[PDB]
């Protein structure tokens, strides 16, 4: 149960516990359930970081790849969930196959720390300092929350652009 010194452990206040887990998911201190949960959290955060980069490289700048994606206009592909059906099914299949191949080629080994899935090479540092592990986990949490709130909020507003909605909300 030595989760106070783990990466991404948030102590809200000085009297607060060393980490945050109000539902007691790792209250026993399994040290193996926690490793699985941290691998899951890291993977979710990295996927969401890539998704947020996709969202914020497109709007409000309007940038997109020129041309067509298999008889489909790229400028006709929206930003957000509306692009799920706009993108051709074959393109989604290819992207899913690429991600599946990445998972197969770079799986999680029990000897390596959770999230250290990149194959070992001198160029790529692993597992990094605890400061950088915490930074990765925190930016991943932010991207996770951000994409959840993009999806829930694009449906609620009827499809408003997230940048336009934020500008209206904060008056800029």
């Amino acid at each position: 149960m030595s989760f106070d010194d783990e990466a991404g452990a948030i102590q809200w206040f000085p009297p607060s516990p060393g980490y945050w887990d109000p539902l007691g998911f790792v209250a026993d201190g399994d040290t193996e359930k926690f490793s699985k949960y941290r691998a899951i959290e890291i993977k979710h955060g990295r996927v969401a970081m890539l998704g947020a980069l996709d969202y914020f490289i497109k709007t409000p700048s309007g940038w997109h790849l020129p041309g067509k994606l298999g008889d489909v206009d790229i400028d006709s592909i929206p930003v957000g969930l509306g692009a799920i059906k706009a993108v051709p099914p074959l393109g989604w299949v290819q992207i899913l196959l690429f991600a599946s191949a990445l998972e197969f080629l770079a799986p999680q080994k029990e000897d390596q720390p959770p999230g250290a899935v990149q194959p070992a090479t001198p160029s790529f540092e692993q597992p990094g300092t605890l400061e950088y592990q915490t930074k990765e986990i925190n930016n991943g949490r932010l991207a996770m929350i951000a994409l959840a709130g993009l999806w829930l909020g694009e449906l609620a507003s009827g499809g408003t652009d997230p940048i336009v909605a934020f500008k209206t909300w904060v008056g800029i």
Partner: protein, 178 residues
């Protein structure tokens, strides 16, 4: 015995009066930490009030930064309570967030309670540039100015409402027939 007679801020009205003012006995049967927290709260409330009245003094003299918060400029933000709704809520949220950042950086051990070796109000992080503690005289001066500011900010608020929105300095001049 007056246990808190070694703390700054004690006002002695008369030579035969008590060393510090406490008619209702708010400090009776209070340990060192309880009075420490009360004095810490006094200093923080007073510093906040001093900053607020300094804002009133600077803006009421006509001075304004050339800031443009979205569609609202500093020339469209009234002096007084009317700035609560006129200024965009995002600016208010960011100011509150800055205050929270300062609180995090200055109350990390204590969380508003006593930190051993630190007098109440000594919130600036230790550095040779900032002569932090000071003597009792300068601490009493800071406390008295803070109390004056707390009185004056509420005099501004209750008094802007009573006058119906009259400028505080214009109202002061009119009341004094200046």
């Amino acid at each position: 015995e007056f246990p808190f007679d070694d703390q700054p801020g004690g006002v002695k009205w008369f030579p035969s009066s008590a060393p510090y003012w406490d008619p209702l006995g708010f400090t009776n049967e209070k340990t060192e930490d309880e009075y420490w927290r009360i004095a810490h709260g006094e200093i923080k409330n007073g510093r906040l009030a001093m900053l607020a009245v300094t804002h009133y003094f600077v803006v009421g003299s006509g001075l304004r930064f050339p800031f443009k918060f979205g569609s609202v400029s500093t020339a469209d933000v009234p002096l007084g309570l009317g700035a609560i709704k006129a200024l965009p809520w995002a600016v208010w949220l960011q100011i509150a967030a800055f205050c929270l950042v300062l609180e995090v950086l200055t109350e990390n051990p204590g969380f508003g309670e006593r930190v051993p070796g630190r007098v109440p109000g000594n919130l600036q992080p230790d550095t040779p540039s900032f002569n932090a503690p000071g003597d009792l005289e300068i601490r009493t001066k800071e406390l008295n100015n803070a109390r004056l500011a707390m009185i004056s900010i509420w005099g501004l608020w209750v008094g802007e409402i009573a006058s119906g929105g009259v400028d505080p300095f214009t109202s002061f001049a009119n009341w004094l027939k200046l």
